[PDB]
Write a protein that binds this ligand. Structure first.
Ligand SMILES: CCCCCCCCCCCCCCCCCC(=O)OC[C@H](COP(=O)([O-])OCC(O)COP(=O)([O-])OC[C@@H](COC(=O)CCCCCCCCCCCCCCCCC)OC(=O)CCCCCCCCCCCCCCCCC)OC(=O)CCCCCCCCCCCCCCCCC
Ligand SMILES: CCCCCCCCCCCCCCCCCC(=O)OC[C@H](COP(=O)(O)OCCN)OC(=O)CCCCCCCCCCCCCCCCC
Ligand SMILES: CCCCCCCCCCCCCCCCCC(=O)OC[C@H](COP(=O)(O)OCCN)OC(=O)CCCCCCCCCCCCCCCCC
Ligand code: HEM
Ligand code: HEM
Lengths: 53, 380, 72, 60, 267, 101
């Protein structure tokens, strides 16, 4: 990111890739919460919290 | 730009091996089995690693450490019985893989075949020492029996057996060195399997017809990838219904007692993947001759490339040799049944006839049948 | 090494998309006769060894249970 | 008004990221519901034999 | 007898356009058409309606292996929207982004199309060209390349990537370049009396009217990058294509790899 | 006599490659001698052999066989690789007996 990414085409490419990156970060967040079985997120759910997990 | 799959120096190997490898379109489900073997191998390693995390190789604290794994470690019973039943299923896949190689004429790949025979010897040694490892009654007495028949060798057998033992009997030196060898051998098997796949990929794989399959070839992905996932899941089904419903139908009850050199069991036998070898051993009334016959049984399996006297590769169009092949398979089943029996009537004569027919079918009758169908099809 | 494995002339292959065709097209109705066809081709080569060794197993078990009897 | 697999594909399965998102969401829903159903079935097979069926005569 | 039946069934006035281009006044042409083409037997003699049922597109592949041919031709195409769909105009811009290339092109590495630039940098293809063939409600939207055998799969990969780029990462610069290319090609194609007459006849037969050139300019002008990637995701993304191959087409993959090339796991 | 021919025909039906449309000479496992015999073949017989092998592989993939009218009969089973193979074995034996002296 020295000088060649300082351009409008690259900014509009990054703006195009914001929702895909955000959806993949959401996928990683939900997968991390489900896999590590975090209590601090799964206590505010309607259905999963009955097992306390 | 470029293609990262084919131009990266690391991804080129995976692309050449498992992604864009040309494979025959008509290979059956038996072609899954060897891949399953590799999966089973790493499964064993994974379970073994966790069984190495709570086991102590010492005769005072081996059986107690195994019971500590079964009772106190969280799901340690699951990993231990997965290790044992996956060893049994590893040999199931081994016998079906070798039987595929014998039936479909895959032994014409001579370097791959001999490398595979080396892998077979290594996994049999690994399983033998691993069965010695939990230090039950049958572990100690099976190790004693195998080392005594190794001591039957003239003039070097006694020195070799007291050097394998590390002493005058089976003791904690033997247990520790068997733990070390049982640990280290599967990585040698993994490197040897890499060489096995290398020789196969530079020679190509074989179809069940035995014909040249270059006319109809498909990539490995996504056909045989998903076919091997289905085979892996079926292998997991059989392994999980063996570990979760019948944990001891293949195991030995006398292994659940602590090892006692003073008390000998009324019946001493190895596990079921050694039983046909033991029955071949028990038939010949000469211990040097029995060990000679065992090693030459596995070596005539290795020598099977040099007995091919037919113009057709596979047994798909050879029904007489098909009949002889199924006689051989049923004879192997008979030897497996006899190996778990004592030396009583009528098991001696049945075992002797079984070993004689086994060696005669492998050595004599199969090239004779090949010549007979060669004449009978006007080939020569 | 696709592209140089063999040399084939004048062969036309037609294939469908997996999304335009059924996964199990007439599964049982054309699966059962093919299974019995393969069975009819293979049982006369496969089964009689297993029948013979089942007979040997039963005879050996019978002789072992008879050989431990009292009389004489 | 299309079929429910049509709108299910067009809203859930067309993009790979939301495909994986619904795989994860259905995975956590499925693990909760499947553990509920499996413990219900295993409880229904074994009346009067488990410890949780008899921990009132002794717990006090 | 069958030719006479075909003439009696198909050569009728409501399916006939007399087009003239050049130094032709409409009054003289109308007077000559009224004098000569007044009687055409436009009655349905058999009293059976000839219709035009829609055609079913089939995702499939045909491959004609013949290894004695020196070069391999491969065409991959998906279903087009039709004659009367406005989105065809947008698809034309999409083809103008992909463009075409032949081995006798004087440009070289510095071609604007990434597919042509990578094809001349890696010496992949003899030629490629995009096409949008249109029929009533249907059509074929795709690409055609001739190349040697050893390049085929690589070329397919690059072509698929370009399609997915237009479904995902179409920026305004190449959209403007495709708009200018479509403007120049669609105006300079109508140079001469013959292409003008062909445009008049085909436009009156297909659209029911002759579309003015300023209407084409106004339809090109509204195309930006967002609707171009919307239309490309509608027609190219996650679709089942049709593949036709002829020549040494062994390295041309199965239908499953080409079908897997129509979507990105990263997107 | 004719009994041996009928029993050979029964074994030919029992072998099973004729149900795949194959011939006898297609079922040869290709060694170097068979490879040179295929290399010496005319183009039409080579193309017929390649299509027959490809069709046999396609049928073996689907675990199916041809219909009984399309089975290769014992009468018209032309032995096309035998003279090329015989000359290849003869030339190899000539090279062998030269190298043994
Ligand atoms: C009589 C009973 C009914 C028979 C019947 O319905 O047959 C239909 C049908 C008849 O076959 P077909 O008419 O030749 O047409 C199917 C094709 O051959 C294509 O099908 P296929 O036969 O090639 O199937 C692929 C093969 C692929 O095989 C594998 O993937 C297995 C690989 C080996 C696994 C070994 C595990 C370890 C074993 C240790 C002992 O699958 C199997 O062998 C079984 C798959 C079972 C999936 C789960 C079903 C529940 O049978 C099958 O497709 C077989 C599976 C039946 C269930
Ligand atoms: C075993 C159960 C019966 C299996 C069976 O039905 O096998 C028949 C099958 C016939 O296959 P084929 O004739 O090639 O094809 C016919 C049309 N496709 O034949 C086959 O599938 C044969 C391939 C499997 C061969 C191995 C089976 C026995 C496994 C143990 C072998 C042990 C070998 C020695 C190892 C220690 C030394
Ligand atoms: C007729 C059907 C009646 C019932 C109708 C219902 C349908 C059933 C299926 C019908 C099939 C029709 C025919 C199509 C199949 C193909 C032909 C076939 O299989 O024929 C039967 C076969 C004939 O033999 P074939 O291999 O064809 O050729 C030999 C050369 N004459 O014959 C055989 O393969 C017979 C093999 C017999 C083997 C006997 C072995 C005895 C000895 C075993 C010892 C093993 C243990 C040794 C232990 C030693 C130590 C104790
Ligand atoms: C490098 C990988 C491996 C390690 C670290 C390993 C380690 C161990 C350990 C610690 C034990 C004793 C635990 C117990 O059985 O209670 C054991 C047992 C055993 N291992 Fe392995 N092992 C490995 C690979 C294998 C392989 C590849 C096989 C053969 C398929 C095998 C077969 C066995 C058998 C049969 C037993 C005896 C199980 C029983 O008690 O009945 N092991 N292994
Ligand atoms: C120790 C475990 C073994 C592993 C992990 C293993 C692994 C594999 C793999 C992955 C393949 C390719 C897939 C296939 O076609 O089946 C294969 C094929 C083969 N293996 Fe093994 N193998 C093992 C044991 C053996 C043994 C003991 C032999 C010798 C009898 C052997 C001989 C062969 C042959 C001849 C083939 C080629 C068969 C063919 O592709 O047509 N393998 N093996």
């Amino acid at each position: 990111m020295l000088s060649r990414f300082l351009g409008p085409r690259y900014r509009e490419l990054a703006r195009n890739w914001i929702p895909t990156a955000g959806m993949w970060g959401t996928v990683g967040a939900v997968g991390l919460v489900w896999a590590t079985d975090w209590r601090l997120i799964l206590d505010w759910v309607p259905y999963i919290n009955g097992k306390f997990k | 730009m470029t293609n990262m799959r084919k131009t990266h120096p690391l991804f080129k190997i995976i692309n050449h091996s498992f992604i864009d490898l040309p494979a025959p379109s008509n290979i059956s489900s038996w072609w899954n089995f060897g891949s399953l073997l590799g999966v089973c191998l790493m499964v064993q390693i994974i379970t073994g690693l966790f069984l190495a995390m709570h086991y102590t190789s010492d005769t005072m604290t081996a059986f107690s450490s195994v019971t500590h794994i079964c009772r106190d470690v969280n799901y340690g019973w699951l990993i231990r019985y997965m290790h044992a039943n996956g060893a049994s299923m590893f040999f199931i896949c081994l016998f079906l893989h070798v039987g595929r190689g014998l039936y479909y004429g895959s032994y014409t790949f001579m370097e791959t075949w001999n490398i595979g025979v080396l892998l077979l010897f290594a996994v049999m040694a690994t399983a033998f020492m691993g069965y010695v490892l939990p230090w039950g009654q049958m572990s100690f007495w099976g190790a004693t029996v195998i080392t005594n028949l190794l001591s039957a060798i003239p003039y070097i057998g006694t020195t070799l057996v007291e050097w394998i033992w590390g002493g005058f009997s089976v003791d904690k030196a033997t247990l520790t060195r068997f733990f070390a060898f049982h640990f280290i051998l599967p990585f040698i098997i993994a490197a040897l399997a890499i060489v096995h796949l290398l020789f196969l990929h530079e020679t190509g794989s074989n179809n069940p017809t035995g014909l040249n399959s270059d006319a109809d070839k498909i990539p490995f992905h996504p056909y045989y990838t998903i076919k091997d996932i289905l085979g892996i899941l079926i292998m997991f089904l059989i392994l999980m219904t063996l570990v979760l419903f019948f944990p001891d139908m293949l195991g030995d009850p006398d292994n659940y007692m602590p090892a006692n050199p003073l008390n000998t069991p009324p019946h001493i036998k190895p596990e079921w993947y050694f039983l046909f070898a033991y029955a071949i051993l028990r038939s010949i009334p000469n211990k040097l001759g029995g060990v000679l016959a065992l090693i030459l049984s596995i070596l005539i399996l290795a020598l099977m490339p040099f007995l091919h006297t037919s113009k057709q590769r596979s047994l798909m169009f050879r029904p007489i040799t098909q009949i002889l092949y199924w006689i051989l398979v049923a004879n192997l089943l008979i030897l497996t049944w006899i190996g778990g029996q004592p030396v009583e009537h009528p098991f001696i004569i049945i075992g002797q006839l079984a070993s004689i027919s086994y060696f005669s079918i492998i050595l004599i009758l199969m090239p004779i049948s090949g010549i007979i169908e060669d004449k009978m099809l006007k080939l020569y | 090494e696709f592209g140089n494995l063999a040399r084939i002339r004048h062969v036309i292959s037609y294939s469908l998309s997996p999304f335009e065709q059924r996964a199990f097209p007439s599964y049982f109705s054309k699966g059962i006769p093919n299974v019995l066809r393969r069975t009819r081709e293979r049982i006369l080569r496969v089964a009689p060894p297993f029948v013979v060794v089942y007979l040997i197993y039963t005879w050996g078990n019978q002789e072992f249970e008879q050989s431990k009897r009292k009389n004489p | 008004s299309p079929t429910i697999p049509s709108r299910l594909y067009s809203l859930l399965f067309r993009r790979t990221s939301t495909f994986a998102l619904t795989i994860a969401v259905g995975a956590l829903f499925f693990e909760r519901a499947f553990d509920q159903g499996a413990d219900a079935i295993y409880e229904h097979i074994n009346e009067g034999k488990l410890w949780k069926h008899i921990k009132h005569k002794y717990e006090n | 007898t069958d030719l006479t039946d075909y003439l009696n069934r198909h050569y009728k006035a409501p399916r006939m356009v007399l087009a003239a281009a050049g130094g032709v006044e409409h009054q003289q042409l109308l007077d000559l058409a009224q004098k000569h083409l007044s009687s055409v037997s436009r009655v349905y003699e058999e009293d059976a309606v000839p219709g035009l049922t829609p055609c079913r597109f089939t995702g499939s592949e045909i491959r004609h292996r013949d290894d004695a041919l020196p070069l391999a031709h491969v065409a991959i195409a998906v279903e087009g929207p039709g004659w009367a769909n406005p989105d065809n105009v947008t698809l034309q811009v999409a083809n103008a982004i992909i463009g075409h290339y032949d081995c006798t092109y004087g440009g070289g590495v510095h071609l604007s199309s990434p597919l042509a630039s990578v094809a001349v940098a890696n010496k992949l293809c003899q030629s490629f060209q995009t096409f949008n063939i249109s029929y009533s409600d249907t059509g074929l939207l795709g690409a055609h390349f001739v190349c040697d055998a050893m390049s085929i799969d690589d070329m397919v990969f690059f072509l698929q990537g370009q399609w997915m780029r237009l479904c995902t990462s179409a920026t305004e610069s190449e959209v403007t370049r495709g708009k200018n290319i479509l403007r120049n090609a669609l105006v300079s194609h109508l140079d001469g009396t013959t292409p003008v007459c062909e445009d008049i006849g085909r436009s009156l037969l297909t659209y029911g009217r002759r579309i003015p050139l300023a209407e084409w300019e106004s339809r090109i002008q509204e195309v930006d990058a967002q609707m171009l990637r919307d239309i490309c995701s509608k027609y190219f993304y996650d679709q089942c294509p049709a593949v036709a191959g002829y020549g040494p087409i062994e390295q041309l993959p199965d239908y499953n790899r080409i079908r897997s090339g129509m979507f990105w796991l990263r997107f | 006599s004719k009994w041996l021919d009928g029993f050979r025909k029964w074994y030919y039906n029992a072998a099973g490659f004729n149900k795949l449309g194959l011939m006898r000479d297609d079922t040869l496992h290709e060694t170097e001698d068979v490879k040179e015999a295929i290399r010496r073949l005319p183009e039409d017989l080579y193309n017929d052999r390649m299509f027959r092998i490809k069709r046999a592989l396609d049928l073996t993939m689907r675990h199916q066989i041809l219909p009984k009218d399309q089975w290769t009969k014992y009468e018209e089973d032309k032995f096309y690789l035998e003279p090329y193979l015989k000359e290849v074995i003869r030339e190899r034996k000539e090279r062998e007996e030269w190298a043994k002296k």
